[PDB]
Design an enzyme around this catalytic site. Structure first.
Site, PDB file in Angstrom:
ATOM      1  N   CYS A 379       0.709  -1.747   0.053  1.00  0.00           N
ATOM      2  CA  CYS A 379      -0.047  -0.154  -0.029  1.00  0.00           C
ATOM      3  C   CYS A 379       0.904   1.577  -0.226  1.00  0.00           C
ATOM      4  O   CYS A 379       1.636   1.622  -1.116  1.00  0.00           O
ATOM      5  CB  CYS A 379      -1.264  -0.058   1.389  1.00  0.00           C
ATOM      6  SG  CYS A 379      -2.209   1.223   1.287  1.00  0.00           S
ATOM      7  N   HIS A 505      -3.349  -5.813   0.190  1.00  0.00           N
ATOM      8  CA  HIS A 505      -3.645  -6.285   1.608  1.00  0.00           C
ATOM      9  C   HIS A 505      -3.067  -7.687   1.869  1.00  0.00           C
ATOM     10  O   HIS A 505      -4.329  -8.220   2.342  1.00  0.00           O
ATOM     11  CB  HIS A 505      -4.574  -5.808   2.447  1.00  0.00           C
ATOM     12  CG  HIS A 505      -4.323  -4.428   2.868  1.00  0.00           C
ATOM     13  ND1 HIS A 505      -3.357  -3.479   3.133  1.00  0.00           N
ATOM     14  CD2 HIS A 505      -4.867  -3.233   1.947  1.00  0.00           C
ATOM     15  CE1 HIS A 505      -3.368  -1.971   3.095  1.00  0.00           C
ATOM     16  NE2 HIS A 505      -4.889  -1.651   2.157  1.00  0.00           N
ATOM     17  N   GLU A 507      -1.962  -9.272   3.875  1.00  0.00           N
ATOM     18  CA  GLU A 507      -1.695 -10.169   5.274  1.00  0.00           C
ATOM     19  C   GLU A 507      -2.729 -10.615   5.727  1.00  0.00           C
ATOM     20  O   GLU A 507      -3.549 -10.270   6.441  1.00  0.00           O
ATOM     21  CB  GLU A 507      -1.019  -8.665   6.343  1.00  0.00           C
ATOM     22  CG  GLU A 507      -2.295  -7.789   6.157  1.00  0.00           C
ATOM     23  CD  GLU A 507      -1.761  -6.757   4.916  1.00  0.00           C
ATOM     24  OE1 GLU A 507      -1.100  -7.012   4.472  1.00  0.00           O
ATOM     25  OE2 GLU A 507      -2.200  -5.518   5.398  1.00  0.00           O
TER      26      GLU A 507
END
Lengths: 534, 534, 534
Positions: A379, A505, A507
């Site tokens: 990001c 993202h 994660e």
């Protein structure tokens, strides 16, 4: 089939891990073959968590349906295979918004809207909604018992306990049994009072959880049992451990779930703890190790990058390699300089909001790029890397984002509407899981082994395609683009050993059992580089 | 001259060291040239501490006037030079006894006797009594704030405070600012609530004491100041330390006493902290070291032998030697045997009550005696040694105490009335400081350098003079005898390197600055023996 | 057979008639054929009620076994036939006395005596004692909910309830539903809070009693039911009535007892309310009327002479005549004089303590005697009459009692030990039902129709036999003598239409169904006199 409920509260002090305890229980009850779900009630006035910063509460969880919610909902995803939704978490502010709107619409027909019964009814309805169709519903009550911040919720619960019937509800309560080194022993007094507080608001605990840094003696558990009107067998000790995945084992060890099915009369299937056994095996039998620097801003509170940290861990699990994260303040990179970045096998730059040390972040991106050191940007890290390359390779002096500089002159990042070139010629927030088009010839396409992928987003600004051709033609690979407007999703450096960056993202998709191609590649690259430099 | 008062309370958890804090303050106030004293009020129903065991509350303090009282008054005398009389400590039960008696004899003239106002007046009047003639009076309120055990006292204070005016009273309150390693930080929430609790009973704190294992950040102190309606400078941090003698320094460092005199407008003389400076020097610069065994019964709680341990320390200070105490359960000497007693430079046997493993204590006495290992016996330990020597040297078959075996056959210990010989032919509690005649030719006489001494007592059974001649003639020195009936006070062994045992309690008179001959000699002997055995 | 218990508490304001409500219930339970009994716990430090004045609490009830107890025990005697004993009533002070004594003699073996559990143990053991062998035991808790004066009792109950199980216990709570004329309606808020207070100490009400001066609307009862977690049928309305004897009817009307046996599943016998039906008939159909004047001291609160008032009423019932009692202050007769005594058909002088305007009482006795106005004297009233007659007829100048004027010279009343003549030549408290030998030739013997009678006592000083002979020989009939010491129990005036005075307390035996000979005689004579004067 009738839904059973267990409420989870806690007192004495905060930070006991109520969500962790509940999640671990859910995992066991899952292992007992039960239709288990879980909800959390958020005492905050904020309507949505999106109105708060990452530093305020850490990462904000993105649900499947796009709802933004409490981080603990992700924690629930890490213990049970059921899916969380907007119905699994709402705030105090949310309640008032809804009720006041109903008032405005004449929904209460001229009646006085009162906490009791109207606010509590709003709560009651939401609970029944989320627990509909489930065997067991865990409900985590946020806030601290005795504080006014959550008394309305506690009242709504009491009412439901009575209306539903005790045969379908249990009261679980966390406490603290602190160790007093000066005396050489733990104390129970705080617990006794915590229970008394629940009692004063119409709640009698059934199950007690004794949080501490060590096992609580049976004698002390008995003393508690006495003063709290609770059977000794229902007083559970919970010492601190080095892994949340070991908690199901502990709760099972003390017979908690059996009690519940007898109440709690539950026909619970044999627990499948092999997933934890795997984790343990791997933990106790590492083979390599790598050091990865993390340059950011909220490093003073690990939780801010929790999801990232765990994603790194998972990559390491798949490559049987220890992950040593070095927290680095980007502002120190601006002060001290790149000397900070020495002694690292890989470089990582997490997402977030705010300028602060962003120029130092750029310096770091430059450092990793130019020195061929396994780089992973996410990001904001991608935005940074974009600027780095653009300014120092594509010669885009002051390459920047319009979110910081109104007239960047080389706005490499801007809102789509704001896209413009260096001559001033032109032409909300992306949230949730979105499909991305990977370039078949890219590394990440092959890492994923798929033409397209679906990954989560949380950002408003985009790569300014007006100046992209400058950057890309200078010698930079766009590894993936998005949808309708083919927005840049992933970038790779042509001759860098392993340098990638992305808008999404990853994660939030990584798991301990499945891992995640990206982090596997990153951590692997760290190792490769480590050996390369040795 | 008008007496000023400071009340000391505490909450969240017990065992914060309210007495320690108060004593340290008083020490400073004395160092400021102020007539400061101190009293403690107890939440116990026991009228007198003499009705409770040493294991229940630890050592019972013996005052000058013979009153038995709270151990903390010993601490009070260790910091200020005033005396802790019977007026300096009383219990809840004591109050009721008095009031009920007054009622019984018609002192309330047919009126209803109520907590308010009659019990609270009883309390108030006792406080005023003790504070008479003093500049500053500290009043320690036992129990925990929020518990019913001391609400009457807190109420009595509130009333008093109003009656005497705020210009003559301050509210000090101890709290806990616990460290939560899981979060990596300390929490203040508990404190905030503790203060709210005092407020709910009419008490607004003026001074806050933050107990913890580490200094509390100014920011956190400020947060507390906010929520408690207290000035930042009145929020004092108090981290754990390795010596009580360092606390006056800390309180002084934070300007506590200045605040008080400004309130407290006090013309305080320069603090004389040289007493601790001396201690610090000596602590930091020891010259030897010895290991001394302590065989007893209440060793699971060091506080039970607190005063003894302190006295041992004082002997060590005078001989510049470290005193390593090995706690030994007499029941293990009884079970395992004398192997426990190996590796020791000296042997010590403290006083107390209960059989448990006293035969093992006798075994130990025998061991030290027969092996010439620096032996010190106190109260019961003397009685133990008496039996040892008697039975194994004077051939006194089953020499013993009538408190355990009425038909000893050789009752070496018995009540004076119970004195009898082995053929059955015959002919309360000794408390407080009493004069003892020392034998001029004894070691102890020369250790004190005085014909007679005055020492404190606490026992009921005496050396049975009917059979003394058997013991003494066998070859044992009576180093001292009491007064009226020349009761055996001190015994020494003719050929033992250092064997002294006595009826009195020297540990209640020693100081860190003056020491005490018996511990000086004992510990010295330990060293001598240590070098002897090398 | 297992004993069932019902606890009675009250909140908001005192003086709601907890004893009345409990007694009324018990009456019904007896009427249903159930073995019901009752006990009362009192929140007072006074060990025995005998240490307090009549004006302080009103009459002190004398039980069969001689125990002095709370007035309400007599009220219990008037509703059920189960006899009260010392086991049916005790105080907070009593408890402490017992517990402290146990401490003193070592019954707690060195343990800490605490409210919890030791004071609560004293309480719960006494409760179980009194409830032994009964089907239903009512336990009235004195004091007001929310006050500290009775929290220990409430706690003991909570514990007990848990121990015996909910199947053997019910919670009945009295409240107040006040009428607010300014609003034109009653309010329920206070009740709602009262219930919340019980809940905060672990007690959930099962039955609610709404005291008021008017029937509470079903709607309001429903509102209460809602907020208190109580079934609508368990919310009972109880408006003010003009007779306690009508309450059983009201409770029955609302189905209270049925509920209880269902809980409360009780096979209750049909209520026999004919005793009150009789009373009602008689009440609504009086035939005469008569004015009785009463001279005393505690007339500022009729409760002080409640037992007397009832006894007078009973005499009236048997003679179908309305009894009009004039309250006269002895001090006004002392001041204003006998003009007060005009317009009376008969005069009565009650017992009690305090010199006060007793000389006016004497003046009154003289007045009634000399003017042939029917007269009834009780205890002190006899002492008064004795002095009157002695001083004015037997010429015993300053006839008096040593309890007020030791140096009387004509001590007509004195302690038996203190008996003496006017020349100084000489020669605790009598309690409970004692046998009195009546003189066969006396009116009282014939009024009772028996050689001897048994009547209750309470007094310390006796008729002084040293001077008695002067009084009796002057022309006074001793109508009866005690026993062993032949003490003047009762006297009659030879030529007075009806002048009777005695040592015993006939007012504790009179009932609405049986009546009583002395009140039948007095009241009848009063009426006769009235007619003779008309």
């Amino acid at each position: 089939m009738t839904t059973n409920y267990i409420f989870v509260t806690g007192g004495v002090v905060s930070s006991l891990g109520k969500g962790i305890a509940a999640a671990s229980l859910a995992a066991i009850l899952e292992a007992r073959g039960l239709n288990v779900t879980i909800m959390k009630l958020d005492p905050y006035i904020n309507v949505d968590p999106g109105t708060m910063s990452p530093i305020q509460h850490g990462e904000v969880f993105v649900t499947e349906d796009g709802a933004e919610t409490d981080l603990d909902l992700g924690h629930y995803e890490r213990f049970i295979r059921t899916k969380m939704s907007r119905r699994n978490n709402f705030t105090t502010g949310r309640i008032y918004s809804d009720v006041l709107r109903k008032e405005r619409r004449g929904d209460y027909l001229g009646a006085t809207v009162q906490v009791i019964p109207h606010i509590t009814n709003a709560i009651k309805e939401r609970v029944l909604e989320g627990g509909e169709g489930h065997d067991v519903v865990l409900v985590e009550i946020g806030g601290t018992v005795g504080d006014i911040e959550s008394l309305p919720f506690l009242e709504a619960i009491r009412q439901m306990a009575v209306e539903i019937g005790r045969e379908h509800t249990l009261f679980m309560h966390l406490t603290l049994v602190p160790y007093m080194a000066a005396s050489g022993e733990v104390k129970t007094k705080p617990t006794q009072h915590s229970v008394k507080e629940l009692l004063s608001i119409g709640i009698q605990p059934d199950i007690l959880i004794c949080r501490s840094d060590r096992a609580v003696p049976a004698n002390e558990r008995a003393k508690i049992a006495l003063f709290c009107n609770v059977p000794e067998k229902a007083v559970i000790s919970l010492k601190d451990v080095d892994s949340i995945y070991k908690i199901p084992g502990l709760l099972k060890s003390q017979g908690l779930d059996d009690y519940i099915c007898k109440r709690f009369s539950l026909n619970c299937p044999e627990a499948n703890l092999s997933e934890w056994e795997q984790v343990i095996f791997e933990e106790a039998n590492p083979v390599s190790e790598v050091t990865i620097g993390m340059v950011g801003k909220y490093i003073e509170l690990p939780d801010a990058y929790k999801s990232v940290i765990e994603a790194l861990k998972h990559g390491g699990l798949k490559n049987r390699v220890s992950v040593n994260i070095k927290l680095i303040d980007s502002q120190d990179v601006e002060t001290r300089g790149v000397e900070i970045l020495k002694g690292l096998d890989a470089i990582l730059v997490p997402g977030g909001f705010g300028y602060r040390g962003v120029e130092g972040m750029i310096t770091t991106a430059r450092f990793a790029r130019e020195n061929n050191i396994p780089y992973l940007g996410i990001c904001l890290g991608m935005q940074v890397a974009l600027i780095d390359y653009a300014r120092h390779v594509a010669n885009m002096e002051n390459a920047n984002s319009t979110e910081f500089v109104p007239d960047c002159k080389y706005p490499v990042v801007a809102l789509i509407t704001e896209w413009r070139d260096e001559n001033g010629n032109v032409e909300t927030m992306r949230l949730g899981a979105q499909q991305c088009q990977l370039v078949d010839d890219s590394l990440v396409r092959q890492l994923y082994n798929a033409p397209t992928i679906v990954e989560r987003h949380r950002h408003r600004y985009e790569v300014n395609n007006m100046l992209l051709k400058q950057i890309e033609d200078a010698g930079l690979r766009v590894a993936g683009r998005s949808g309708d407007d083919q927005l840049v999703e992933i970038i790779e450096v042509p001759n860098h050993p392993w340098f990638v960056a992305c808008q999404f993202h990853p994660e939030f998709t990584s798991t301990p059992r499945d891992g995640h191609p990206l982090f596997a590649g990153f951590v692997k690259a760290a190792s490769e580089f480590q050996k390369r430099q040795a």
